[PDB]
Structure formats: C-alpha cells, structure tokens
Subunit: 382 residues, 3 copies
C-alpha cells in the first residue's frame, strides 16, 4: 500500500524488480517465508531522487506482523544501509518470520536517502495461529539465550515506575499544604520567606543527595551485572556485488510511445534487431510492477500478484520468430485495468512524461533475454 | 561576447569545441541556420567549477535575435538540462531560426550549474529582412495551430487591465473625499468612527464578494475553455550517448611550456611518439577557441571565425613526417595577436598557471588524430 | 604520534601503505631523506569519511624539524591538494631536508577533506648538527636567489614597528593630560566641548592625512620595487596516474574472523585458491601499519619500524606450497603486543566491528602477490 499515490513516472524510472519467488503463500506462526528476486537500477535516474549511495532494503507491511529474520543483497547480509550503483542488477533475498495472524499484503522495497520509498510488487500472505505462540530466541556472545519479545521489559518497568514514584513523592510532599491562592497572596504581601522552612531545606538536600547516590549506585550495579557491552552498530556497507548478466543479443529502439488519456492502455512502435540467440519473440512488457504478457509466447508460473499480472495484455502486431538479424518494426499494445487501477494513467499530471520498462524475449529453447527501454510518453486526446 | 573577461586558465581547462560548421553565413527572416560540432570535457576539471552533472546547451547572442528551433546532444533532443561525464566527447547540433535583422555574433555555450558560462567560438551571422515577417507556428495536441509571437497576448492584457481597473475603482471610491490631513485630525481627535459609514461597509462587502465570485467564475470558465492542460515539463536528462573515438596512435609529452609576459606567443617542448598510422605531422594547436595552424600541413576550410584562426601561428622546430615509432622532441611556438586580443596573456593574474589544449596530427592520406595535452605554464620575464 | 587514539576500524578500513623505503636513518643538517612507498585506497571506504576527492599528502612530525623539499604522487609533483579514486593504488615519494637536530618520529600521512588524518607507519630518524647551519635557497624567476629562513623578515619588522609607533604616538599625544576621572566629570557636567581644542582638531587632521599619504606612498614604492608579482597558487590537481598492478592469481575468502577481548591476537579461517603463479605460501598479514610475518616464508629487510614489525606473528595452520588450483582452508593467527600497544584491541569500542588488511603470497621464485581481504570481526569473551 502507498504506490498508487506515487507519481507514475517516478515509479517507472527508479528500480525494476524482475523474477520473484515466494516460498509459501500460507504460513503458520513462527514459520518462515522467503522472498527472492532481482532488482535493476534505471540508468536515467530522476534528478529529484538522490543517487542510491545510501539505500536500505526494507519490507513493506502494516507493521511487525512479520519479523525480518534476515536480508541479503548479492548473497551478503545487509542489516545496515548499503550503496548501490546506477545501471546495475542485484539479487535480493529476504527471510521473514510470521508473528501475527491475518491476511497481509507484503512488498519488497528500497528506501533511498534523499529520495523516499521505492515499493515493489505486493503479495497477499495468510498467517494462521495465535500471536501468543510467537517466540524470538537470540543467543548472545556471553552464553545467554533470551527471548526478544519480553527481554528487559521488567527492568524498564521497574526503573521507570521507581523514578516516577520518586517524582510523585517530591510533588506530594509540597502538595499537602495550600498550593496556589494563599501562597500567591503571601508572596505578593512580602511573606515569601515564611513559605519555606528549615525542614523543607533539609528535605530538598536529602532528595538531591539520594537522587545522585541512587543514580551512581544503579550505574555501578548495571556495570557489574553486564560487564561486556558494545555500542550500537551502524554504518553504510559498500562493495555490494552486482550481477554479471549476458548483454542482450537483442536491440530495441522506441520510435513512438503514446497513451489515450481517457484510456486504459499504452501503445508503442518498436524496431527490434536480433543479434543471434536464434529466432526470438517478445513475451512480456514490465512497466511499474505491472507485467503485460503475450500468452502465446510466455506464461507466468510464479504466483505473480494477479492484480499486477495481465496474462494477455501484450498485443504485438507481428510476434513471429524474429530470425537472427531481422529488423522488424512492430506496434505493441499494453492493455489492462491495472493501468488505471495502479494509476499509471496519472502520468498526465506528471512534470515529466517519459516512461521506462523491461521487455523479455524468448527463443524456441526458452532462453530469455532482457532488454531495457526508455522513451517519452505522449498522451492522445483526439 | 563575455569570454575575454573570463580567466584564461578556466577557458583553457573546461570544454574544448573542435570541428564546427555553420550551414549559412547570411540568412533571411524565418530561415534556419544549423551549427554542428564536437565538444570534449577536460579530464582535469577545475575544482571551483562543479562537475557537469547538470549542464545546459545554450546559444550566446544579445537576445532573441534568433529562436532556438532545436538542440541535439548526441542525436537526442535536449530541451532540458543534461548530465555530462568528465573526459568524454559529444556531438552537438543546434538549429536556430532568424527573427531580427542585423549582424549577430553567435556562440555555442555550455551553462554548467555551480560553474557558470562556458562560451565557445563566436561567428558573425547577418540576418536580412523585417522583424514583422517572423512567424512561430506551433501545433498543439488538441488540434490547434497557434503563433507563439502573439498567442494569449490579448487575454493577458484584458485580465491585467480588468484587475487594475478594479483596484483603481476601489481606491477612487475613497479618493473622492478629503484624504490625509482632515482624516488624520479626526482620528487624533477621537472621531475615527465617523470616518466610515454603513454605506462604506456595504461597499466593502460587495467588493469582497464580487472579487471572490469573479475569481471563481473566471477559473471555471478557463477550465471549461481549456479542459486539457499539463504541468510545466522539467527535469535533468541522463544517459547522453558520447562519441566512441579512435584512441590516438600518437603520444605527446609536454616537457616545458613557457610564455613571455610582455608577450604575444607561447612556446612548448614536446616529445612525440608515433604508434603507427603512417608518418604524421602536427597541423594545429587549439587552446581557448584560438586555433594555431601550420599552413604546410593543414588549411581550415570551414569558415572558422578569422579573429580566432591563426593560419600560420604554429611554428614546429622539425615538422617532418614522424615515421611510425620515431620519438622526436620538438619546440613548438604558437604565436598570434589573438593571444593578447582574447586576453590569454592574462594567465599572469590567474591563481592557477596551468594550460590545456588539443593537438591535431595528419598523415599523408589526410587522416586526423587528436591528442590532448595539459601542463603548467611558466611566465618568462627576462 | 596520534594514531593509537584513532578508532581501530577507521585505521583498518581507510588507506593501506605497503612496501616503503627510507634512504637514510641518520642525516646531517641540510641533508635530504627520501621516503618512497605505495598506498592503496580501501574499496569499502567508511561512510563518515568523505571520499578522497580532495586529499593532501602530508608529513607527520612535531613541526618543521624537516622541510618538505618535494612530494610526488605517481611521479607528479603535488604541492596542492589532489583527487584520489577509491580502490586504486598509487606510488608516493617524499624528499625532506633536515632542519633541526634530534630524534624525530616521521610518518607519511594522507589528510582527507571531510575525513581527517590518515597516518602511516612512523620511523625514527636522527638529525645531527646545528640548526644555525640550515639554509633554504630559492631562485626566483626575476633572477634573484634568496634564503627563505630570513627573507623579508626585516621589512616586516620595520613596517610593523613603524605602524605600532604611530599608534603609540597617537595615544600618547592624548595621554599627557588627565585621562579618566576629570574628563568623565567634565563630560557629566556638560563641559565636553572644552575637552577638545582647535589644535587637537588640526593634529587629528594631520594624522589622518599623513596616514593616508604614507599608505599610498608605501604601496607605490612596493609596486616599484617588485613590479612582477603573481597571486597565491591554489587548486585541486586531478588526473593522478594510478598503478596498473597484476590482478592476484590468488583468491582468498574469509570464513570467520575473531579476537579474544582480554586478548593480544586475532584469528581467521581463510579459504585460499591458487589460480597459477606456481605453489604459493602466505608470508605476511598487514592490518593497521602492523605487519605480521611468517619467518619461514618471508623476512623484512627494509628497516620497517620494529614496534610495528612482528617477524613471527603469522601462524598458519598449514603453510605448505599451495599447488596452483589447491583450495585449502587454513586457520591463521596474527599475534603481537602491537595489537594491544597500537590499541587495535579497542575495536571493542567501535560502532563498526569490521576489519580490512593485506595478505602477501610468495612463490618459490620469490614473486609476490597482494590479496585484499575484508570481513567483520567478532570478539570472543568465553
Ligand atoms: C492521577 C492524577 C492525575 C495526574 C497526576 C500528575 C502529577 C501528580 C500530581 C499530584 C500528586 C500529589 C497528590 C496530592 C497531594 C496529596 C495530599 O495532600 O493528600 C491529602 C489531601 C489534602 O488534605 P486536605 O487539604 O485536608 O484535603 C483536600 C483534599 N480532600 O486530602 C485528600 O483527601 C486527598 C486529595 C489528594 C489526592 C490526589 C492524588 C492524585 C495524584 C497521584 C496520581 C499518580 C499517578 C500519576 C500519573 C497520572
Ligand atoms: C566541581 C566543582 C563543584 C561545583 C561548584 C559548586 C559547588 C557548591 C558548593 C556550595 C557553595 C555554597 C555554600 C554552601 C556551604 C556549605 C553547604 O553545603 O551548605 C549547605 C548549602 C546551603 O547553604 P548554607 O547552609 O547557607 O551554607 C553555609 C554553610 N552550611 O546547601 C547546599 O550546598 C545544597 C544542599 C546540601 C548539600 C548536601 C549534599 C547534597 C548535594 C551534593 C551531592 C552529595 C552526594 C554525592 C553522591 C556521591
Ligand atoms: C496616473 C496617475 C499616477 C498613478 C496612479 C496610481 C494609483 C491611483 C491613484 C488615484 C486614483 C483615484 C483618482 C482620484 C480620485 C478621483 C476624484 O475624486 O476625482 C474628482 C476630484 C476630486 O474632487 P474635488 O475635491 O472637488 O477636486 C479636487 C481635485 N480637482 O476632482 C478633480 O477635478 C479630479 C482630480 C483627480 C484626478 C486624478 C486621477 C489620476 C489617477 C488615475 C490613474 C490611473 C492609471 C494608473 C497607473 C498610472
Ligand atoms: C472555513 C471557515 C470559515 C472561516 C471562519 C471565519 C468566518 C467568519 C464569519 C463571520 C463572523 C463575524 C460575525 C458576522 C456575523 C454575520 C455577518 O456576516 O455579518 C456581517 C459582517 C459584519 O459583522 P456584523 O454585521 O456586526 O455581524 C452581526 C450580524 N450581521 O461582515 C462580514 O462578515 C464581512 C462582510 C459581509 C460578508 C458578505 C459575504 C462576502 C464575503 C464572503 C464571500 C461570499 C461569496 C462567496 C463566493 C462564492
Ligand atoms: C609597556 C606598557 C604596556 C602596554 C602599552 C600599550 C599601549 C600604550 C599605552 C600608553 C602609551 C602612552 C604613554 C603614557 C603617556 C606619556 C606621558 O604623558 O608621559 C609623561 C607622564 C605624565 O606626566 P605627569 O602627569 O606629570 O606624570 C604622571 C606619571 N608620572 O609622566 C611620567 O613620568 C611618565 C609616565 C608614563 C609612562 C608610560 C609609558 C608606557 C607606554 C609605552 C609602551 C610601548 C610598548 C607597547 C607594547 C607593550
Ligand atoms: C568619494 C566621495 C568622498 C566621500 C564623501 C565625504 C567627503 C567629506 C567631505 C567633508 C564634508 C564636511 C564639511 C567640511 C568642509 C571642508 C573641510 O574639509 O573642513 C574641515 C573638516 C571639519 O569641518 P569644518 O572645519 O567645520 O568645515 C567647514 C569648512 N572647513 O574636517 C575634515 O574634513 C576632516 C579633517 C580635515 C581634512 C584634511 C584632509 C585629510 C583627510 C583626507 C585625506 C587627504 C589626503 C589624501 C591623500 C592623497
Ligand atoms: C518510591 C519510593 C518513595 C520514597 C519515599 C522517601 C521519603 C521521602 C521524604 C520523607 C519526608 C520526611 C521529612 C521529615 C522532616 C520533618 C522535620 O523537619 O522534622 C524536624 C526535624 C528535627 O530533626 P532534629 O533531629 O531536631 O535535627 C536533625 C538531627 N537530629 O528537622 C529536620 O531537619 C529533619 C530532617 C529529616 C528529613 C527527612 C527527609 C529524607 C527523605 C529521603 C527519602 C529517600 C528516598 C527513598 C530511598 C529508597
Ligand atoms: C473595471 C470595472 C469597474 C467596476 C465598477 C463597479 C462599481 C463599484 C462601486 C459602486 C459604488 C456604489 C455605492 C453605493 C452606496 C451608496 C449608499 O450607501 O446609498 C445608501 C444605500 C441605501 O440603500 P437601501 O435600499 O436603503 O438599503 C439597501 C437595500 N435597499 O445604502 C446601501 O447600503 C447601498 C449599498 C450599495 C452598494 C453598491 C456597491 C456595489 C459595487 C460592486 C461593483 C461590482 C464590480 C463590477 C462587476 C463587473
Ligand atoms: C613613528 C614616528 C613618530 C612620528 C611622530 C609625529 C609627530 C606627531 C605629532 C606632533 C604633535 C604636534 C602638535 C602641535 C600643535 C600645537 C598647537 O596647536 O599649537 C598652536 C598652533 C598655532 O599655529 P599657527 O601658526 O598660529 O596656525 C597654523 C598656521 N600658522 O595651532 C595649530 O593648529 C598647529 C598645528 C600643528 C599640528 C602638528 C601635528 C602634525 C603631526 C604629524 C606627524 C607626522 C607623522 C610622522 C611622519 C613620518
Ligand atoms: Cu500493499
Ligand atoms: Cu531497470
Ligand atoms: Cu560574441
Ligand atoms: Cu578536451
Ligand atoms: Cu609518531
Ligand atoms: Cu587497501
């Protein structure tokens, strides 16, 4: 939730999430779900979004209904912010543990500093069980195993209640006497010195000394109880390993790209050159989490969110085997209610009417090439 | 105009504009002139100029004597700011349309954010005709063809005059009575409440209600008249395609570079190694829009501004065919009044006495290699 | 001095200084000492240190006990700040001239803007002689040879004394009369106009006119005496040539890296793959200026500061010739008091417990390969 309201061109021109898998659709409490996939950083990064020099891989959900057990970018655990390079592709994996029952829309997201949220496709996952069964065991380097759900709760309650009680006692010591009107009149009359006695001064001295001594003793006792402590671990982790992918033996030029403004579709003229890899055929156009597929060339079998999957939303004028070398100019039409449901038609309000997306080409043997396209998008009103 | 006053080293060390062409020297009104060429970004970019992450290709002229019909960087239209990389070469093309008659010095420039203006060579172009004949037709996506010279002029005049008249009427309603002295005396005397009557309150209420209602009705009518509107299109366009140029089979090392301070020339010792490409010969040294040529090796036939063209300003101790492999140390002398006219001799006031420029080598067949040189420049006073 | 107090991980993860040489250990006054070596910029640059876009090569010493005659980065003199790239290796050379007698700990350092100091290994150098024998001759472009120790000293003294005397005379002219109490009483009584006479006004006018005229005449005389002047030369020098080094035919993966917190050592599990270059053997681990060596494989003969040299501080479970192709998992133990002396054990207070260092592999013929390792460092308390 939160993507439909984001500018259409910003969603089109930031990060592209390609083949994704979810290990389970329905999980029990304390069971783990794995979300893997690839994300590509668009070369034409918008200028109002800072470069992903400081980026964090996040899980979009209405709260800690899951707990993120681990997250890996390129096989490396990423508990901190990371640095990503423009134009590179990265594998990502996220292992989550179920905490609260219910149906949850879970998304993979990249939070970018100086940019904001970049939400990926969301999937509905059902958690069955009771929240009281959730456990979060962690073993420390000191040899102690604790449960993070209730660890250190009683100590915090005790100390906060103790200090609150001390403050309440300090206020109530003075609250046993007339408070506001008689004291104000006495101060106005010049009898302020009569409002504080020697016993009050001794009580204040005792309160101050007891507070300081208790703080010192509590710090000493806490140090004795936990002689081994480390500061909070923070920093930006550089040197993320990107994917070394086969360059596309397929070249695609966008002649024109238009959308009818009333409109639930997008149309584009494309010149495609096959540089080998056998006769190929376009099977899918990915724009903003929406996948328009050509049923005759490719069929999704990964449980891609159906609200974002158009099984026959790709209409190519001529989708015949493009013999290696053939340069065919084709008119592709990407049509689906998701265009209007995911407010991609709101590119009419955007201060930049340019789109970007991914095209997937398959040969007879099923090998897939990914081609990256970007162009300006012209609205049609006649 | 405006380059002679810019620091000599800043002009030497930012952008180099090489082979340029102008389609016409004399044009009529509404006729188009094309300026094409190449620009190279110097690797040793000055630190006080921000990197050209946000750069705009501009035309330097005393105003809209021309209108910039289009501009292309690497074959791509660039109506917005673009991103350029240090050390890369780009083709550029600018098509301008003549608007005002007269002789105009036209320059191609790169405005760089956090840096300032980078002016290129200027050429004198004559426009013959009358300004009243200039037309700027534009066809909109709604099917309307308009002339940008006078489009929406009458509407703006009408609305501004209407609101100015309303304000004048509001002031003049109160201006029919004594204004300053009697009213001031009455306010001082305590008779302020007598200065505003019930009729005045009713008039003020009517003015407020009429203003609000007129604004609302005008907005509704404007929306009805123009139901299709888009916001201003802005942004920085990345992914500019640079030139893939042959690396210079010629290696040049600058041993020493000196200039006499009184002085109208510059001298340099150079070690040149030919790595193939047949016997070569130096034909031209480009510094800051100034081209020093060796008449025996090369002759300009592009109409390069004569104030910046020194046909025999390159004197090479030995400019004989440098057999592939020969490593000759030569003393080159670049001499021309342009050195003093374009204030390149003002490098003596610069906080950085280092120069950069381009050397052009030609073989027997006429093939040209471009070598890029940079060194510190030492003034000579004895 | 000043490195032991710097965070251990910051010292481990910034710049690595490898093979270094000092021309002399004991020098006389006016004699020169050359310090050469290589420095590598770590790929995982810490986020709190700005990238070395503006870096200066500096000499760490308690003052001008030496004078830095020259400094070269990649064979190019670097009197100004320079730009360095992450992940590149550079040669550096520094020629210093002895000025003051005594024993001096001299370090090579890289000052990085927005980062702070990066100190390298320090060496003790003895200077014998008298400071009065030190000379700093410099020949100017005007044909004058001067000594920078005493040049322009007398002129500065004369002008400062002259202006101080003028100010003292101005104060003392008024100081001959009663100063504070009688004048205050007269001003309070309304007799302020009697405290300044016409002669005082004439004296003030003469002082003002003489000051302005003297300033103008002094400027004119200084211009006449030195008709050739240049501004201060400043700027950041880009285009530093890095080393083109053989990629390591040796691959090393860090399985685990741990240190006992009481502790004077560090332990690591490593998987090493030989990709040719004959049977190899680990001979040295460099962490933070500390070099742990395996005496049986390599011996230092460069006079590396002994406080930072552990001749037998590298213990490899199996350090037998790793036949090209062999993938052996070995347990290496780097032990030395320098770990505690140079406060590398203070990584326990660091907000980032990750280390980086260099491994040196030698074959039978003595050829050396450098492998770069980085991992998180886990403290052991049991
Ligand atoms: C829950 C209260 C709201 C917020 C409290 C915030 C800070 C505390 C303020 C007052 C503390 C001192 C009590 C008054 C002097 C406590 C005090 O003096 O009590 C005797 C009073 C005074 O004697 P008197 O002049 O002969 O009688 C006048 C009132 N009948 O008599 C009483 O019968 C008791 C009345 C006082 C009861 C108020 C207690 C509520 C405060 C404790 C709340 C603790 C929880 C805090 C978080 C919400
Ligand atoms: C690092 C330097 C210290 C900071 C400088 C200021 C220090 C001030 C000193 C007092 C100067 C004022 C004159 C008072 C003369 C001595 C003095 O302390 O008198 C009591 C004064 C009231 O002043 P007075 O009676 O008119 O003074 C005349 C002689 N008694 O109250 C206080 O000082 C505050 C309340 C009583 C203090 C008891 C200790 C509790 C507070 C400290 C914590 C102790 C427990 C430590 C935990 C381990
Ligand atoms: C061009 C004027 C300069 C700038 C104007 C700026 C804002 C407007 C100020 C005054 C408007 C109300 C007029 C006075 C009450 C208009 C008004 O009350 O006119 C009757 C006056 C007053 O009657 P009275 O007391 O019996 O006579 C005294 C003056 N003789 O009599 C007149 O004979 C007319 C004199 C007033 C003429 C001034 C008009 C100029 C202002 C309009 C300019 C519009 C263009 C604006 C942009 C420049
Ligand atoms: C979103 C919330 C609204 C903002 C809150 C403030 C609103 C204020 C309300 C009035 C409170 C003061 C008491 C007045 C009582 C009602 C009232 O409006 O009285 C007239 C008052 C003068 O006060 P009064 O006579 O002593 O009031 C006693 C009873 N009449 O003048 C005004 O309110 C201003 C001039 C007359 C207003 C006429 C409408 C023109 C202005 C609004 C635009 C209407 C056209 C819309 C275009 C589509
Ligand atoms: C070294 C002094 C410290 C700093 C000086 C800073 C600025 C100068 C202040 C005073 C200058 C005017 C002198 C007084 C009027 C100089 C002056 O009027 O001298 C005659 C006085 C006054 O005559 P009187 O009323 O009959 O006698 C009263 C004092 N006996 O008599 C004297 O016997 C001389 C006393 C004055 C000597 C003070 C001189 C010190 C200042 C010069 C220092 C220069 C070095 C500067 C850097 C440190
Ligand atoms: C660029 C524009 C200049 C700045 C504008 C202000 C200039 C001010 C002028 C004076 C106006 C006040 C009326 C005084 C009338 C003329 C005048 O200068 O009178 C003397 C006034 C005192 O005023 P007054 O006697 O009541 O004036 C009545 C007629 N004399 O003192 C001063 O002006 C200051 C002290 C005397 C000046 C002598 C010259 C020394 C200062 C300047 C440097 C000269 C040497 C140059 C070196 C090459
Ligand atoms: C959450 C836990 C709540 C803690 C509650 C603590 C109690 C707080 C205040 C008690 C007020 C009694 C005032 C009696 C003066 C009532 C009073 O003033 O009585 C006259 C005495 C006469 O004493 P004397 O013998 O003639 O002279 C002194 C030596 N003999 O004067 C005084 O000066 C008596 C001073 C006594 C002050 C006691 C207050 C100390 C409170 C510290 C509390 C510590 C916090 C808890 C620790 C875990
Ligand atoms: C650029 C175009 C210029 C537009 C010029 C607009 C004219 C402006 C002001 C007229 C002043 C007349 C004042 C008469 C009070 C003169 C006045 O006060 O007369 C006494 C009346 C008595 O009226 P009554 O009948 O006894 O009671 C009300 C119901 N019957 O009192 C009032 O309260 C009369 C109020 C009348 C106010 C009229 C002003 C409205 C002006 C709106 C202009 C709209 C803008 C143009 C639209 C395109
Ligand atoms: C470090 C070097 C130190 C320099 C010391 C300079 C001496 C400073 C002040 C002298 C005070 C004498 C005051 C006499 C008034 C004492 C005074 O006021 O005497 C009455 C005269 C009467 O003169 P008169 O003839 O009747 O009228 C004028 C034409 N004839 O009035 C005046 O107005 C006299 C004005 C004389 C002022 C002289 C002060 C000039 C000082 C400039 C110094 C230059 C700096 C050094 C250059 C290298
Ligand atoms: Cu959602
Ligand atoms: Cu992409
Ligand atoms: Cu010009
Ligand atoms: Cu260049
Ligand atoms: Cu030291
Ligand atoms: Cu390194």
């Amino acid at each position: 939730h939160g993507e439909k309201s984001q500018a259409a061109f910003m969603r089109m021109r930031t990060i592209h999430w390609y083949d994704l898998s979810w290990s389970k659709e329905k999980v029990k409490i304390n069971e783990t779900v794995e979300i893997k996939g690839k994300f590509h950083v668009f070369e034409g990064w918008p200028e109002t979004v800072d470069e992903p020099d400081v980026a964090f891989l996040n899980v979009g959900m209405p709260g800690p209904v899951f707990i993120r057990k681990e997250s890996y970018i390129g096989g490396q655990l990423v508990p901190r912010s990371v640095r990503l390079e423009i134009g590179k592709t990265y594998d990502f994996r996220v292992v989550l543990k179920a905490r609260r029952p219910g149906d949850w829309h879970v998304h993979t997201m990249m939070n970018v500093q100086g940019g904001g949220p970049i939400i990926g496709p969301g999937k509905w996952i059902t958690v069955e069980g009771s929240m009281s069964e959730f456990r979060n065991p962690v073993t420390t380097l000191t040899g102690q195993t604790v449960d993070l759900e209730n660890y250190n709760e009683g100590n915090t309650y005790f100390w906060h209640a103790f200090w609150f009680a001390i403050g309440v006692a300090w206020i109530g010591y003075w609250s046993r006497r007339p408070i506001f009107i008689p004291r104000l009149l006495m101060v106005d009359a010049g009898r302020a010195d009569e409002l504080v006695s020697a016993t009050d001064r001794k009580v204040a001295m005792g309160f101050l000394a007891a507070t300081i001594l208790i703080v010192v003793m509590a710090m000493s006792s806490a140090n004795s109880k936990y002689p081994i402590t480390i500061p909070l671990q923070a920093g930006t982790m550089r040197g993320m390993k990107p994917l070394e992918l086969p360059a596309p033996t397929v070249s695609v030029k966008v002649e024109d790209a238009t959308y009818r403004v009333p409109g639930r579709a997008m149309r584009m003229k494309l010149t495609i050159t096959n540089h080998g890899n056998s006769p190929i055929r376009l099977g899918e156009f990915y724009t903003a989490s929406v996948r328009f597929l050509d049923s005759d060339v490719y069929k999704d079998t990964t449980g891609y969110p159906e609200d974002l999957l158009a099984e026959d939303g790709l209409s190519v004028s001529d989708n015949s085997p493009l013999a290696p070398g053939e340069t065919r100019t084709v008119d592709v039409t990407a049509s689906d209610a998701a265009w209007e449901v995911y407010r991609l038609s709101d590119i009419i309000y955007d201060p930049d009417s340019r789109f970007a997306g991914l095209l997937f080409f398959f040969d007879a043997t099923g090998n897939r090439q990914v081609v990256q396209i970007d162009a300006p998008l012209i609205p049609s009103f006649m």
